[PDB]
Design a binder for this molecule. Structure first.
Ligand SMILES: COc1ccncc1NC(=O)c1ccnc(NC(=O)C2CC2)c1
Length: 346
């Protein structure tokens, strides 16, 4: 019935408290372990509890990263605690996160199975908030490395998006190599596909670009069950990466045989109804050269999102838009003058 734990609050000083929850249901499995849902007895609030085997030598990287994240577009770590259950003698870490009822993945698939497109206002809202969460985590040097629709939480009532699953997230340090095999099918940046170990946070941006494209197309823009098929799909849109473009990602994948194809016009990729600002944003996200891709903040400032900056804009359900402008010094640090655009007169 009721489970009572002594859990450490995610934020502030390490001062644990007796927390009680009930109504436990499984809502997710994964290589990481299990995600439960539960109801706090104190507030009646719903939480997701992510339970992962804790081993054993060092501190859990995900926990360390989530404890220092505080942002309206990032899933909130309310508590964490340790327990048993399964394995025995092996210890588990439980992350107690504020529950969010939907995902971009589930919402997009509703539209896709109805053979309809998500209305562009939602694309703008969701994409903008995704780029904020990225601008934020990148300001600490943290790369998410698994940006995909299922890791994008939504409250359908308020249209707030929250980035989750920091299971793959890492603090990227120049010159310290990182595993190339992160990030999920369709959303992998071409340098990851080429197995680069010196990649940057701009892989998060490529993935976001793939998410944007998918929301406009109603299906993944770069499908394929292997790297070589994805790469073909990318080359069909972007053209063949030059010897230099290859070099800017390549562990020398120069000299290899790539299908030669000229850059297909980006306007021809989407429905004719698709706003040009949407397409222009895509072509600035999905670039071969990682440094040529927009930074998350610059993307927030893109003209595609101007409607979000209209004082008269409202949600289709009649309510107001979430707080889109409460930028901090931290968030703006990669380009402070962009504040002129990011924060509208109201
Ligand atoms: C599968 O979800 C995850 C995968 C990996 N790590 C963490 C999470 N999940 C989360 O962190 C998480 C946090 C808060 N709410 C949800 N809600 C949902 O999933 C509803 C759509 C059902 C998931």
């Amino acid at each position: 019935k009721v489970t009572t734990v002594v859990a450490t609050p995610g934020q502030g000083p390490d001062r644990p408290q007796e927390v009680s929850y009930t109504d436990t249901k499984v809502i997710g499995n994964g290589s990481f372990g299990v995600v439960y849902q539960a109801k706090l007895c104190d507030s009646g609030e719903l939480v997701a509890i992510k339970k992962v085997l804790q081993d054993k030598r060092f501190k859990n990287r995900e926990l360390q990263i989530m404890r220092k994240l505080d942002h309206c577009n990032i899933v909130r770590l309310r508590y964490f605690f340790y327990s048993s259950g399964e394995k025995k003698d092996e210890v588990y870490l439980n992350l107690v996160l504020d529950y969010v009822p939907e995902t971009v993945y589930r919402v997009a698939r509703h539209y896709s199975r109805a053979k309809q497109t998500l209305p562009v206002i939602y694309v703008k809202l969701y994409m903008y908030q995704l780029f904020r969460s990225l601008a934020y985590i990148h300001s600490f040097g943290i790369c998410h490395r698994d940006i995909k629709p299922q890791n994008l939480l939504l409250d359908p009532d308020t249209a707030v998006l929250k980035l989750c699953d920091f299971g793959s997230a890492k603090q990227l340090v120049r010159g310290e190599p990182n595993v190339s095999y992160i990030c999920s099918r369709y959303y992998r940046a071409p340098e990851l596909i080429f197995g680069a170990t010196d990649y940057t946070s701009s892989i998060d941006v490529w993935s976001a670009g793939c998410v944007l494209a998918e929301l406009l197309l109603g299906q993944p823009i770069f499908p394929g069950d292997s790297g070589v098929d994805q790469l073909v799909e990318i080359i069909k849109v972007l053209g063949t990466p030059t010897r230099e473009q290859i070099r800017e990602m390549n562990p020398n994948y120069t000299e290899f045989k790539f299908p030669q194809i000229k850059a297909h016009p980006w306007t021809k990729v989407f429905r004719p109804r698709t706003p040009p600002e949407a397409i222009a944003l895509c072509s600035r996200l999905l670039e071969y050269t990682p440094t040529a891709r927009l930074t998350p903040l610059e993307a927030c400032a893109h003209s595609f999102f101007d409607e979000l900056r209209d004082p008269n804009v409202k949600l289709p359900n009649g309510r107001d838009t979430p707080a889109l402008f409460n930028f901090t010094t931290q968030e703006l640090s990669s380009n402070p003058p962009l504040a002129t655009i990011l924060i509208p007169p109201h």
